[PDB]
Every structure is written in C-alpha cells, then in structure tokens.
Amino acid sequence: VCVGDRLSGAAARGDVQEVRRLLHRELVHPDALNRFGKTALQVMMFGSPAVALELLKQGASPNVQDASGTSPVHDAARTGFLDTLKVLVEHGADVNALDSTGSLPIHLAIREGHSSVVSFLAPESDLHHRDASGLTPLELARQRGAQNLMDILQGHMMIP
C-alpha cells in the first residue's frame, strides 16, 4: 500500500522534509504499513533523531516488533546512535525488549562496542538476563575482551 511505502521510504532515506510533509501537510497515519509489513519507525535511518521525533510526536507506536522480536530500540542500540535511542525511550520504548536470540538492546550494544550506549542502558536494563548463548551482558563483554565495558557493567551490579 502506497502511503506506507512513501512514508517509510522517506524515513529510511533520512528525508526529514518529506516525512514532515507527509505527516503534517497530508496528515498521514504514522503507523501505516508498507508493502513489506513494516512501519516507518521500524525501518528509519536510525542516525537521524529528527525522523524518529516527527514520527513519535505524531503517534507512532514505539514498541513495534517484527517477526523475531526486533524493535526500534534494538536497532538504535546495535547501530550505536544514542541520540535516537534517547528519543525512543523518552517516548515510551521498552529497553528490556527481547529479540529472538533473547538479547536485550544492551547485549547488542556490547557486541558492537558502543560504550556510551552501554552506559546509558546499564542502570535500566536487566543485567542478570541471559541471551540464547547463555551470556549475561557482563559475560558477553568479558568474552569480547571489552574491559571498559566490563567496568561499566560491574559498577551497576555490585550494589552492596
């Protein structure tokens, strides 16, 4: 269906002027489905917080998932764009959503090395949660040899 194609195409190109035109000038529903079954917030250029913001201010559902359980907060954390992740969580995105490998957004951020994202997510994330390879966030970091990430995580776990 064609408006969902146009709106999601614009979002995935980071064309914020066409996103704004479609949403405010043509008043299009921000959760319209494209021909692949996705909304614009699922497929958007994740390093453009201005796109996320327009879409969420107009009503987009922040907790959409695809088949597997991947949500926008997983992709923001994997790609490492903390500015867009903060917009998502300010609008109600769940930072403890699980994808199909049973990973949290912080597992993905650790795997890619994104240390400002891991500091932001550490205090709200379930740091005891094990992914499908049996690894908590700290165990994963240690397996990668990521000493800076370990220190961040362990400070949130050593409550005592």
Partner 1 sequence: GLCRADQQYECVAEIGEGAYGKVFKARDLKNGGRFVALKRVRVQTGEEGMPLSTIREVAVLRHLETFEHPNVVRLFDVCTVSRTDRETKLTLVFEHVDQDLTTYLDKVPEPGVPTETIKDMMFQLLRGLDFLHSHRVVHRDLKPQNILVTSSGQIKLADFGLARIYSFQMALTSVVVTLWYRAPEVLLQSSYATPVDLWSVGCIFAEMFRRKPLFRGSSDVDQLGKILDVIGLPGEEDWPRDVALPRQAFHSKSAQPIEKFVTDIDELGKDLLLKCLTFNPAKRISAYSALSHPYFQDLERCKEN
Q: Which residues bind partner 1 (CB under 8 A)?
A: 5, 8-9, 11-14, 16, 34, 36, 38, 42-43, 45-50, 66, 68, 70, 74-75, 78-83, 99, 101, 108, 111, 114
Output the smallest distance, CB 84 to partner 1, in A.
9
Q: Does an H or E element contain 8, and which?
A: helix 2-13
Output the smallest distance, CB 156 to partner 1, in A.
21
Q: Please tell me whether residue 114 adopts helix, strand or coil conformation.
A: coil
Token representation of residue 119: 């500091």
CA distance 10 to 12: 6
Number of other residues whose CB lies within 10 A of the CB of residue 129: 16
Q: Which is nearer to partner 1, 121 or 158 (CB)?
A: 121
| 108 touches 72 (CB < 8 A) | no
Q: Which is nearer to partner 1, 90 or 157 (CB)?
A: 90
Q: Which is nearer to partner 1, 101 or 157 (CB)?
A: 101
